[PDB]
Coordinates of N, CA and C in Angstrom, one line a residue:
Chain A
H3 N 0.8 -1.2 0.0 CA 0.0 0.0 0.0 C 0.9 1.2 0.0
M4 N 0.3 2.3 -0.5 CA 1.0 3.6 -0.6 C 1.2 4.2 0.8
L5 N 0.2 4.1 1.6 CA 0.1 4.8 2.9 C -0.1 3.8 4.1
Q6 N 0.5 4.1 5.3 CA 0.3 3.3 6.5 C 0.1 4.3 7.7
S7 N -0.9 3.9 8.6 CA -1.0 4.7 9.8 C 0.3 4.8 10.5
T8 N 0.6 5.9 11.1 CA 1.8 6.0 11.9 C 1.7 5.1 13.1
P9 N 2.7 4.3 13.4 CA 2.7 3.3 14.5 C 2.5 4.0 15.8
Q10 N 1.8 3.3 16.7 CA 1.4 3.9 18.0 C 2.6 4.2 18.8
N11 N 3.7 3.3 18.7 CA 5.0 3.6 19.4 C 5.7 4.9 18.9
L12 N 5.3 5.5 17.8 CA 5.9 6.7 17.3 C 5.0 7.9 17.6
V13 N 3.7 7.7 17.6 CA 2.7 8.7 17.9 C 2.8 9.3 19.3
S14 N 2.9 8.4 20.3 CA 2.7 8.8 21.7 C 3.6 9.9 22.2
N15 N 4.8 10.0 21.7 CA 5.8 11.0 22.2 C 6.1 12.0 21.1
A16 N 5.2 12.1 20.1 CA 5.4 13.1 19.0 C 5.4 14.5 19.6
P17 N 6.3 15.4 19.1 CA 6.4 16.7 19.6 C 5.2 17.6 19.2
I18 N 4.9 18.6 20.0 CA 4.0 19.6 19.6 C 4.9 20.8 19.3
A19 N 4.6 21.8 18.4 CA 5.5 22.9 18.1 C 5.9 23.7 19.3
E20 N 4.9 23.8 20.2 CA 5.2 24.6 21.5 C 6.4 24.2 22.3
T21 N 6.8 22.9 22.2 CA 8.0 22.5 23.0 C 9.2 23.4 22.7
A22 N 9.5 23.8 21.5 CA 10.8 24.5 21.2 C 10.6 26.0 21.0
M23 N 9.5 26.5 21.5 CA 9.2 27.9 21.4 C 9.4 28.6 22.8
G24 N 9.8 29.8 22.7 CA 10.0 30.7 23.9 C 11.1 30.3 24.8
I25 N 12.1 29.6 24.3 CA 13.2 29.1 25.1 C 14.3 30.2 25.1
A26 N 14.7 30.6 23.9 CA 15.8 31.6 23.8 C 15.4 32.6 22.7
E27 N 15.6 33.9 23.0 CA 15.4 35.0 22.1 C 16.5 35.0 21.0
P28 N 16.1 34.7 19.7 CA 17.1 34.7 18.6 C 18.0 35.9 18.5
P39 N 27.0 15.3 35.2 CA 25.6 15.6 34.7 C 25.6 15.7 33.2
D40 N 26.5 16.4 32.6 CA 26.5 16.5 31.1 C 27.2 15.3 30.4
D41 N 27.8 14.5 31.3 CA 28.6 13.3 30.8 C 27.8 12.3 30.1
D42 N 26.7 11.8 30.8 CA 25.9 10.8 30.2 C 25.1 11.3 29.0
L43 N 24.9 12.6 28.9 CA 24.2 13.3 27.8 C 25.2 13.2 26.6
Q44 N 26.4 13.6 26.7 CA 27.4 13.5 25.6 C 27.6 12.1 25.2
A45 N 27.5 11.1 26.1 CA 27.7 9.7 25.9 C 26.5 9.2 25.0
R46 N 25.3 9.6 25.3 CA 24.1 9.2 24.5 C 24.2 9.9 23.1
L47 N 24.6 11.1 23.0 CA 24.8 11.8 21.7 C 25.8 11.2 20.9
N48 N 26.9 10.7 21.5 CA 28.0 10.0 20.8 C 27.4 8.7 20.2
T49 N 26.6 8.0 20.9 CA 25.9 6.8 20.5 C 24.9 7.1 19.3
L50 N 24.1 8.2 19.5 CA 23.0 8.5 18.5 C 23.5 8.8 17.1
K51 N 24.7 9.4 16.9 CA 25.1 9.9 15.6 C 25.7 8.8 14.7
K52 N 26.1 7.7 15.3 CA 26.8 6.6 14.6 C 25.9 6.0 13.5
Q53 N 26.6 5.7 12.3 CA 25.9 5.2 11.1 C 24.7 6.1 10.7
Chain B
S2 N 41.8 30.8 15.1 CA 41.7 31.3 13.6 C 40.2 31.7 13.2
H3 N 39.2 31.1 13.8 CA 37.8 31.6 13.7 C 37.3 32.0 15.0
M4 N 36.7 33.2 15.1 CA 36.0 33.7 16.2 C 34.6 33.0 16.3
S5 N 34.2 32.6 17.5 CA 32.9 31.9 17.6 C 31.9 32.9 18.0
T6 N 31.4 33.7 17.1 CA 30.5 34.8 17.3 C 29.0 34.5 17.5
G7 N 28.5 33.4 16.9 CA 27.1 33.0 16.8 C 26.6 32.4 18.1
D8 N 25.3 32.3 18.3 CA 24.6 31.8 19.4 C 24.3 30.3 19.2
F9 N 25.1 29.4 19.8 CA 24.8 28.0 19.6 C 23.5 27.5 20.1
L10 N 23.0 28.1 21.2 CA 21.7 27.8 21.7 C 20.6 28.0 20.7
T11 N 20.5 29.3 20.1 CA 19.5 29.6 19.2 C 19.6 28.9 17.8
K12 N 20.9 28.6 17.4 CA 21.1 27.7 16.3 C 20.5 26.3 16.6
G13 N 20.8 25.7 17.7 CA 20.3 24.4 18.1 C 18.8 24.4 18.1
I14 N 18.2 25.4 18.7 CA 16.7 25.5 18.7 C 16.1 25.6 17.2
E15 N 16.8 26.5 16.4 CA 16.4 26.5 15.0 C 16.3 25.1 14.3
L16 N 17.4 24.4 14.5 CA 17.4 23.0 13.9 C 16.4 22.0 14.5
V17 N 16.2 22.1 15.8 CA 15.2 21.3 16.5 C 13.8 21.7 16.0
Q18 N 13.5 23.0 15.9 CA 12.2 23.4 15.3 C 11.9 22.8 14.0
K19 N 12.9 22.8 13.1 CA 12.8 22.1 11.8 C 12.5 20.6 12.0
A20 N 13.3 19.9 12.9 CA 13.1 18.5 13.2 C 11.6 18.2 13.6
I21 N 11.1 19.1 14.4 CA 9.7 18.9 14.9 C 8.7 19.0 13.8
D22 N 8.9 20.0 12.9 CA 8.1 20.1 11.7 C 8.1 18.8 10.8
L23 N 9.3 18.3 10.6 CA 9.5 17.1 9.8 C 8.9 15.9 10.5
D24 N 9.1 15.8 11.9 CA 8.6 14.7 12.7 C 7.1 14.7 12.6
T25 N 6.4 15.8 12.8 CA 5.0 16.0 12.6 C 4.5 15.5 11.3
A26 N 5.3 15.8 10.2 CA 4.9 15.4 8.8 C 5.2 13.9 8.5
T27 N 5.6 13.2 9.6 CA 6.1 11.7 9.5 C 7.3 11.5 8.6
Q28 N 8.1 12.6 8.4 CA 9.3 12.5 7.5 C 10.5 12.2 8.5
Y29 N 10.5 10.9 8.9 CA 11.3 10.5 10.1 C 12.8 10.5 9.8
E30 N 13.1 10.1 8.5 CA 14.5 10.1 8.1 C 15.1 11.5 8.2
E31 N 14.5 12.5 7.6 CA 14.9 13.9 7.7 C 14.9 14.4 9.1
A32 N 13.8 14.1 9.8 CA 13.6 14.5 11.2 C 14.8 14.1 12.1
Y33 N 15.2 12.8 11.9 CA 16.2 12.2 12.7 C 17.5 13.0 12.5
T34 N 17.9 13.3 11.3 CA 19.1 14.1 10.9 C 19.0 15.5 11.4
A35 N 17.8 16.2 11.3 CA 17.6 17.5 11.9 C 17.8 17.5 13.4
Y36 N 17.2 16.5 14.1 CA 17.4 16.4 15.6 C 18.9 16.3 16.0
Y37 N 19.6 15.4 15.3 CA 21.0 15.2 15.7 C 21.8 16.5 15.4
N38 N 21.6 17.1 14.3 CA 22.2 18.4 14.0 C 21.9 19.5 15.1
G39 N 20.7 19.6 15.5 CA 20.3 20.5 16.6 C 21.0 20.2 17.9
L40 N 21.0 18.9 18.3 CA 21.6 18.4 19.5 C 23.1 18.6 19.6
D41 N 23.8 18.6 18.5 CA 25.3 18.9 18.4 C 25.5 20.4 18.8
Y42 N 24.6 21.3 18.3 CA 24.7 22.7 18.8 C 24.3 22.9 20.2
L43 N 23.2 22.2 20.7 CA 22.8 22.4 22.1 C 23.8 21.8 23.1
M44 N 24.5 20.7 22.7 CA 25.6 20.2 23.5 C 26.7 21.2 23.7
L45 N 27.0 21.9 22.6 CA 28.1 22.9 22.7 C 27.6 24.1 23.6
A46 N 26.3 24.5 23.4 CA 25.7 25.5 24.2 C 25.8 25.1 25.7
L47 N 25.4 23.9 26.0 CA 25.5 23.3 27.3 C 26.9 23.3 27.9
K48 N 27.9 22.8 27.1 CA 29.3 22.8 27.5 C 29.8 24.2 27.9
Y49 N 29.4 25.2 27.2 CA 30.0 26.5 27.4 C 29.2 27.5 28.2
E50 N 28.0 27.0 28.7 CA 27.0 27.9 29.4 C 27.5 28.1 30.9
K51 N 27.5 29.3 31.3 CA 28.0 29.7 32.7 C 26.8 29.9 33.7
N52 N 25.6 30.2 33.2 CA 24.4 30.4 34.1 C 23.8 29.1 34.5
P53 N 23.8 28.7 35.8 CA 23.2 27.4 36.2 C 21.8 27.1 35.8
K54 N 20.9 28.2 35.9 CA 19.5 28.1 35.6 C 19.4 27.8 34.1
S55 N 20.1 28.5 33.3 CA 20.2 28.3 31.8 C 20.7 26.9 31.5
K56 N 21.7 26.4 32.2 CA 22.2 25.0 32.0 C 21.1 24.1 32.4
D57 N 20.4 24.3 33.5 CA 19.3 23.4 33.9 C 18.2 23.3 32.8
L58 N 17.8 24.4 32.2 CA 16.8 24.4 31.1 C 17.3 23.7 29.9
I59 N 18.6 24.1 29.4 CA 19.2 23.5 28.3 C 19.2 21.9 28.5
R60 N 19.6 21.5 29.7 CA 19.7 20.1 30.0 C 18.3 19.4 29.8
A61 N 17.3 20.0 30.4 CA 15.9 19.4 30.3 C 15.5 19.3 28.8
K62 N 15.7 20.3 28.0 CA 15.3 20.3 26.6 C 16.2 19.3 25.8
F63 N 17.5 19.3 26.0 CA 18.4 18.4 25.4 C 17.9 16.9 25.6
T64 N 17.6 16.6 26.8 CA 17.1 15.3 27.2 C 15.8 14.9 26.4
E65 N 14.9 15.8 26.3 CA 13.6 15.6 25.6 C 13.8 15.3 24.1
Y66 N 14.7 16.1 23.5 CA 14.9 15.9 22.0 C 15.8 14.7 21.8
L67 N 16.7 14.5 22.7 CA 17.5 13.3 22.6 C 16.7 12.0 22.7
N68 N 15.7 12.0 23.7 CA 14.8 10.8 23.9 C 14.1 10.6 22.5
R69 N 13.6 11.7 21.9 CA 12.8 11.5 20.7 C 13.7 11.1 19.5
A70 N 14.9 11.6 19.4 CA 15.8 11.2 18.3 C 16.2 9.8 18.4
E71 N 16.4 9.3 19.6 CA 16.6 7.8 19.9 C 15.5 6.9 19.5
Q72 N 14.3 7.3 19.7 CA 13.1 6.6 19.2 C 13.0 6.5 17.7
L73 N 13.3 7.6 17.0 CA 13.4 7.7 15.5 C 14.4 6.8 15.0
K74 N 15.6 6.8 15.6 CA 16.7 6.0 15.1 C 16.4 4.5 15.2
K75 N 15.8 4.0 16.3 CA 15.3 2.6 16.4 C 14.3 2.3 15.4
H76 N 13.4 3.2 15.1 CA 12.4 3.0 14.0 C 13.1 2.8 12.6
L77 N 14.1 3.7 12.4 CA 14.8 3.6 11.1 C 15.6 2.3 11.0
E78 N 16.3 1.9 12.1 CA 17.0 0.6 12.1 C 16.1 -0.6 11.8
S79 N 14.9 -0.5 12.4 CA 13.8 -1.5 12.1 C 13.3 -1.5 10.6
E80 N 13.1 -0.4 10.0 CA 12.7 -0.3 8.6 C 13.8 -0.8 7.7
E81 N 15.1 -0.5 8.1 CA 16.3 -0.9 7.3 C 16.5 -2.4 7.4
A82 N 16.3 -3.0 8.5 CA 16.4 -4.5 8.6 C 15.2 -5.2 7.9
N83 N 14.2 -4.4 7.7 CA 12.9 -5.0 7.2 C 12.3 -4.3 6.0

């Protein structure tokens, strides 16, 4: 088929535009660790 | 040899806002790439940020977008194997 419903495991934590708005006017170790893992391939 | 004049925070946000638009459109391949681009800038904003309240907020947002990017990546690994 041309189209498929988006899977429920992707829908549930879908962003709303509001999340990234109003942040800025135009502990860190495990975060850098996860980012290192995320970028691969 | 290059001055770092720009705002990494607002650059990171710009890229995440694009990712969110793509994510909403179900364009997950492009969204995933946009998220990780945004996160590289936010990570540098975090590393260099001297205001603790600002660091706290950046950390909270970084985590949220990182959680989502990780979900997309698993989805793409799944489509790729299948």
